[PDB]
Amino acid sequence: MENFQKVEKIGEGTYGVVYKARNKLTGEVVALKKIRTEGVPSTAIREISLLKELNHPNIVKLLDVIHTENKLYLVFEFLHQDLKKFMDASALTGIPLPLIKSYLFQLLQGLAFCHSHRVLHRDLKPQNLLINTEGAIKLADFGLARAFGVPTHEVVTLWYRAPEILLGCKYYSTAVDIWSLGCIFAEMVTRRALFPGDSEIDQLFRIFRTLGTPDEVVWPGVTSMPDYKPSFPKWARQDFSKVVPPLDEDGRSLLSQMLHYDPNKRISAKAALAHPFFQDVTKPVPHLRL
Numbered sequence: 001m002e003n004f005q006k007v008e009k010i011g012e013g014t015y016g017v018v019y020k021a022r023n024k025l026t027g028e029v030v031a032l033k034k035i036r037t038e039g040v041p042s043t044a045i046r047e048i049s050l051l052k053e054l055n056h057p058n059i060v061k062l063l064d065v066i067h068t069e070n071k072l073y074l075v076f077e078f079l080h081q082d083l084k085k086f087m088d089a090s091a092l093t094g095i096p097l098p099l100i101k102s103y104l105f106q107l108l109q110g111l112a113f114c115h116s117h118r119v120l121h122r123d124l125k126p127q128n129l130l131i132n133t134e135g136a137i138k139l140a141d142f143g144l145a146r147a148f149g150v151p152t153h154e155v156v157t158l159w160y161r162a163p164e165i166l167l168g169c170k171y172y173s174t175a176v177d178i179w180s181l182g183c184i185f186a187e188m189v190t191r192r193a194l195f196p197g198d199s200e201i202d203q204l205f206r207i208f209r210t211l212g213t214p215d216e217v218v219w220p221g222v223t224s225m226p227d228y229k230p231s232f233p234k235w236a237r238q239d240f241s242k243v244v245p246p247l248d249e250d251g252r253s254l255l256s257q258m259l260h261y262d263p264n265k266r267i268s269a270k271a272a273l274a275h276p277f278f279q280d281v282t283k284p285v286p287h288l289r290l
């Protein structure tokens, strides 16, 4: 904008570009997202202005929404690093379990809050989980699909997409976020993406190959879904101890519940917080190189 100075470009999206900026007047440093077009749909600006009220310590604060000259600016509190970068930097050593558990616990708290207020993220990924030096981790760049929908030179990653979305479900439930967070949990533990699909069908088949091709037994209604094909190959579920070694049984149990095929059987964020895995949760600080 004009009340700001683009320190640097910190991100790219199909929607818009993200900049680290400094408020010429208040001096506060923020992340600024710029978006495209002929009048900007209002049904969007309303679901957006509503997110300005969704305040929680584990949700990146949306400071302002500014619609001007066919441009939409979202001003957010700035964090210094995202989990994707932190994982790459911790890849040789691995994030210590206590920190993984603390991050998973905080993210479930952020989701429990969003979900209790009927708001879904829809596009959780390491790149939009932001961390600070205080040991906090926060949810950012909400999918605002209910605000806009589902999305140059920016291929959308499908690695964290819940199976019901890939199968063409018309209505997303809060379970899509739990699925995405389970995939992230597995990735933090193993230091490798759980289901790195490079196309929608490849994404779906990688999930099937690991968790077994779903059927009416484990997911009632699955065979009636829009993109379900009877011709899908039938893979047997793989031994789950092979999925996230060396994660302990409490962690494996919780992950397995976050990855249930049936959105109705999938654990909620609130129930996940009560899982035995968090009996010894603590809040360590990460070592950050900024």
Ligand SMILES: C=CCNc1nc(N)c(C(=O)c2ccncc2)s1
Pocket: 010, 011, 013, 018, 031, 033, 060, 076, 077, 078, 079, 080, 081, 082, 127, 128, 130, 140, 141
């Ligand atoms: C991760 C380091 C840069 N600092 C950031 N800080 C914040 N708050 C960021 C975002 O809210 C964000 C917006 C749109 N897409 C992705 C992230 S990015």
